[PDB]
Amino acid sequence: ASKLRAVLEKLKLSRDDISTAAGMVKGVVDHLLLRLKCDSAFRGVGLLNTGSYYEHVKISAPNEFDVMFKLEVPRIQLEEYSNTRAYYFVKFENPLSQFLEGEILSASKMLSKFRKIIKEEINDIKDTDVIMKRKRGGSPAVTLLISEKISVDITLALESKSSWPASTQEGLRIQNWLSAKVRKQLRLKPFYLVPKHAKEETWRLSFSHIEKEILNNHGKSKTCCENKEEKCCRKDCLKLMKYLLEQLKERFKDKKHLDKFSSYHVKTAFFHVCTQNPQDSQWDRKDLGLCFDNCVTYFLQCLRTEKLENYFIPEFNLFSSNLIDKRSKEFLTKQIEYERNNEFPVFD
Report the run of H or E that residue 249 belongs to, with start and end: helix 234-251
Q: Of the ranges 70-78, 95-103, 155-163, 229-237, which one interacts with Zn ion (CB under 5 A)?
A: 229-237
- Output the 3-class SS for 50-83: CCCCCCCCCCCCCCEEEEEEEEECCCCEEEECCC
**Contact present, 156 and 111 (Cβ < 8 Å):** yes
Taking contact as CB under 5 A, which single stretch among the options 72-80, 110-118, 217-225, 316-324 is the one that binds Zn ion? 217-225
- Which of 312/319 has CB closer to ligand YM9? 312
Among 211, 284, 293, 306, which residue sits at the site for ligand YM9 (rule: CB under 6 A)?
A: 211
The answer on whether 66 is annotated among ligand-binding residues is: yes
Separation CA 249–CA 339 (nearest Å): 13
Decide if 317 contacts 306 (C-beta within 8 A).
yes
Closest separation in Å from C-beta 267 to Zn ion: 17
Question: Is residue 210 part of the contact set for ligand YM9 (CB under 6 A)?
Answer: yes
270 among the known binding-site residues? no
159 is annotated as contributing to ligand binding: no
Q: Which of 171, 172, 177 lies closest to 282 in space, CA to CA?
A: 177
Q: Is the peptide bond before 140 cis (omega within 30 degrees of 0)?
A: yes
Closer residue to ligand YM9 (CB): 147 or 275: 275
Find the binding residues for ligand YM9 in span 255-294 (CB under 6 A). 264, 267-268, 271
Nearest approach in angstroms of CB 45 to ligand YM9 is 20
What is the DSSP-derived secondary structure letter of residue 163? P
d(CA 267, CA 286): 22
Task: Point out which residues bind Zn ion (CB under 5 A).
Answer: 219, 224-225, 232
Task: Point out which residues bind ligand YM9 (CB under 6 A).
Answer: 206-208, 210-211, 214, 264, 267-268, 271, 311-312
**Binding residue positions for Mg(2+):** 64, 66, 153
